[PDB]
Copies of this chain bind each other. A is one copy, B any other.
């Protein structure tokens, strides 16, 4: 059987992070987590490109530019959506997720999903460096794995 997998050592890997500003008090913890994950797995901070955008809505178009860079191995999308009173959350969460996934397939490059989609503020806090971990760290670890996988698969 031929088996392909990615290790979790990040030496030499180069990452793009796109991070929105809405709910920044939480997003900033996700960004801290993603960078820490990369660095302590052996990636160099210098090899990270961070792009800031206003909201989750704007993440895909920026991620599309980063993922097109030949010197970026994977893109990590970071944001925090918390349901409000209206269905706005639904439409943004749907389009952010669809856009990122579509871009990944179009560009044949891993784009990982570190966007919290929470019904409540409590759920978002839980996932931004408290009881349920740090979604930024999770999405970064995924990106490390996928970038290494792609070194043999792509």
Residue numbers of A with Cβ under 8 A of B are 1-9, 23-26, 28-29, 32-33, 35, 40-42, 45-46, 48-55, 57-58, 60-62, 64-66, 80, 82-88, 91-95, 97-99, 101-105, 108-113, 116-119, 121-131, 134, 141-142, 145-146, 149-150, 153-154
10 shortest interchain CB distances as A-B pairs? A25-B129, A54-B142, A95-B101, A91-B97, A5-B52, A2-B49, A4-B51, A25-B29, A8-B40, A61-B104
**Is B95 a contact partner of A87 (Cβ separation < 8 A)?**
no
Q: Which residue of the partner chain, among B33, B41, B54, B98, contacts A95 with CB atoms under 8 Å?
A: B98
Report the copy number of this chain in the oligomer. 7
With A9-B9, A41-B9 as given contacts, are A58 and B117 in contact (CB-CB < 8 Å)? Answer: no
